[PDB]
Amino acid sequence: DAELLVTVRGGRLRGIRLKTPGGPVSAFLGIPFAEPPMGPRRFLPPEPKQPWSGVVDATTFQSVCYQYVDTLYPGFEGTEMWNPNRELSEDCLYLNVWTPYPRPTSPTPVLVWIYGGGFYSGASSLDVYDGRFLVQAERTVLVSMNYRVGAFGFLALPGSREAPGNVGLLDQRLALQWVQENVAAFGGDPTSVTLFGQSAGAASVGMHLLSPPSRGLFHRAVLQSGAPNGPWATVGMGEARRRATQLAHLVGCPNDTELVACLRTRPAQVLVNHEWHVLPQESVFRFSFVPVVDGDFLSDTPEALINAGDFHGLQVLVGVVKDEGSYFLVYGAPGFSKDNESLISRAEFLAGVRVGVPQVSDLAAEAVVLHYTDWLHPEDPARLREALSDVVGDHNVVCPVAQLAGRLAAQGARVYAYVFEHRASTLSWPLWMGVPHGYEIEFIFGIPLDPSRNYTAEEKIFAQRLMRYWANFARTGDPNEPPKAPQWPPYTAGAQQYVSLDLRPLEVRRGLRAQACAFWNRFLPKLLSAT
Template sequence: MHSSLIFTALVGILARIVSADENGDALKPTPTATISNGTIIGTTTSIPGPTSAIPVNKFLGIPYAAKAVRFSPPQPHAAWTTALNTQKYGNACMQAFPPVALRPFTESVFSDDPKPNEDEDCLFINVYAPKKQWDPNNPFPVMYWIYGGAWKFGDTSQRWYDGSHFAALEDVVVVSVNYRTNAFGFPISPSVPLNQRNLGMLDQRFGLQWVQDNIRHFGGDPDKVTVFGESAGGFATDALVTSNAPNFHAAIMESGVYAYLLAGPCDNNNFNAWNALVQALNCSSGDQTAQFNCVKNDRTQQQIKDAQEAGNGITFGFACDEVTLVSNPRTRLENGQTKNIPVILGSNTADGSLYSWTTFANNNTTAYVNARLSGNRTIQAGIERVYPIPQPGGPDNATILGSVDTDWFFHCPGYWYGLTSTKSKPTWRYIFNAEFKNTRARVPSGWTWPEQYQRAWHSSEIPIVFTSYDAPTAESTQNTLSNTMRHAWGYFARNHAPPSELNWPQVGKGSGGKDVIEFGTDKKAGVSIVEDVDHCDFWESMGFKNFHA
């Protein structure tokens, strides 16, 4: 008994010594950390605080896996013996911006300038950590960011994804992970085993394991990890929830879920995209194996990128491997068979404005639904009735058509998800309705997307959540709303519930059962609890709620 107590005391002393050493490394002017692979050298930035600047440690471009092998799952990185400089972002994964007619617009809106270097060697992770003494018995919560990009593009170096304000002002450690997209990340080929087709999702999980193995060296708590993402990143977050993935403990989904995505179930035998890629790369000679080897071994990364971006583009989907992506997410959610963790989810009031403007700005509702739902006259007539346009033609139609896309693809899936999720796990929903000039989309020369039609557009909440907008041009109301939302997200990561001062009701618990919080009630800093009035009953009556099993 006595020797046991001595051993316990020694372990505690040893832990404090190790922690003190790591604190010392983190507090150096040029911070270092020793992770499982070796020592890394970071950099320090500072964020304006209430009274003085607050320092933050940044470790950028840390390899969390070995150099990616084309069409193969991530593998562990070998150890290094010399300290590795991690003071700038690593390569972005290979991007694809189809169709070619919209590429200048899409690249301008969703990429920074200058654009990052693209390479298949892209499995890098970034850590933003408070530069302060930490208590090993009370480490910082961790927030793990998954970017969006329609599963075709995206990377962690975008300025909107900088986690410095979270680290400085909320005392959380933010981690952002690069993952493969398009054909490089989802090679849906008959020659690829089913359990290796969702490489991008395997990358995300590999990054989560890296967090478990290493985040304590930055002051983070591996037992308090919140995954959050937007659009495809929200989908990916839900894929982790509905598949009961390990290594995280709470989730935030911004403008994207999987369980009620209105795209129908997986088809693991649909190889149309792969066949189109094979044809475009002149790899169609020989049998299936020869074709696969041609794409894998005989074509450059640039050739594969170009083939996907040409013409109307080649779009790769997903595989329901029942590990990274289950085939019955709705049923699992309704039966309480998903990961039992607290969830925040929501959408923007004009999530669909980007898509309606770029494609249908001058068309009427009939032209729109013919393009979206060719041949289904019942649904077409219903949309024309619920979303009427008095005067066919003209750019003002974009506002109404944007509402169709918003409800169809973003708002209603989130609405249904919340009502189901709250039956088995604490769930909160939000609506984002704020508009600020310095978060308008960057529209390239020669293109138009008038500000009055952008509104609270898809992804415009991200710089408010991260406080990563251009500070010198910020409005005071913008700073106020950003402080509110960033704190709500950070508080949730620490306490698995929103801060009490928001009076944010759980889904189904407020008056009428439809109460949600609205950020930007007055399109600025207003925050209020509102009843979610929508057209989701219409979409449910058309059968869209039950697309997934």
């Protein structure tokens, strides 16, 4: 009691205390930050939550934004651990605040988390995103919010007032504004807000970075295994409405106003039923409704913007996991499955290249195959499996992230790069998948510290070591102890240094998969251009 009651600009809230092997934390879950996007509001930018009379129950997580549920593997943790753990509703714009106990006396640094899920799924209420451990351990305010996904948050009819697009990023922004106005009520310091997200959440972060209106809402950014410039992160106005129209047709609709009006009358599930149809097909690591380069939220393509931007007075932390690619291959790549070592044949490998690298000339694939093939062992399955995994990872995550890092650092920003390479002991995926996409999160959030879970004593320490890094960055814009321990060098565009994150101490290395990224970032472009 006592500090489980807080009054914000909108009204009163009644939080709750969460228990931790180190102490309690005060959590206020399910704070409404926008008027629910129902019916007439569906597809439109969020509107501020009007002040409520009385006290709001912030003792539990709110509805998960309506989305598709990945049922690939029934009863499998590696797959269900990301599924929604609350009821699905369009009424889903709520945020959560985790503040130290006893409430900090001086304004403490805030960390805002934006979950990932390819813009088609995700929720801040997932167990792996539980702030209780990180707040208790580093005593910093932690805020996470819910933003619309799928068509509900990204379907666009470019130029229309009925379905502008990017409303999902608008929800995110509205929450950051709510943080600027209310975070103080929990001892949070609005002049020190660090954003951090993974996958599409990291892509989101990067777009707030490239979108001026968002710039006065944070001070530091952390992009984990994802970047705004990834080939899956954005879609052009053309594609945008081609897809939003296919959906309208499939669902029997019908003039944009006429179209959207009809759309708004369809039950949410009806829209999700046809979400994956609108995908231009033949690929993996590709999602239907994602952010649009409308000229509004994004005045130009992420690439264009990253290059022309002045990033002085900015600190960014960027990184990737040991095996970005692995995870996705099991969703179409011929010969891949979680239920066996997926030791593909040189034959499937070649057909997988076309899957993992959509819309690209036959000659382009040759160039990929040339590079990713070990010509001393062209037929070895084990290597081709790891190879197609690199192709996907590199093309979708590592090279886009690597490029951003080089441009940011080169143009005024302090940058720190990492490579999380440590498979969790509890990991539920096949061993051939190594350290897959999204499996560094559980450690950044200190989940190993949770008793009900069987982590090793050494992993519990690792997580603590990681939380320190993140916290130190949030607090000072610098990872290492602001000592006599291995130092983390900033990522320069020249030296290209980064550190490996595992149980062993920090080891510095040069080159973020450089040889490969030169193909993806420098050559491949020139090739496609000249064909």
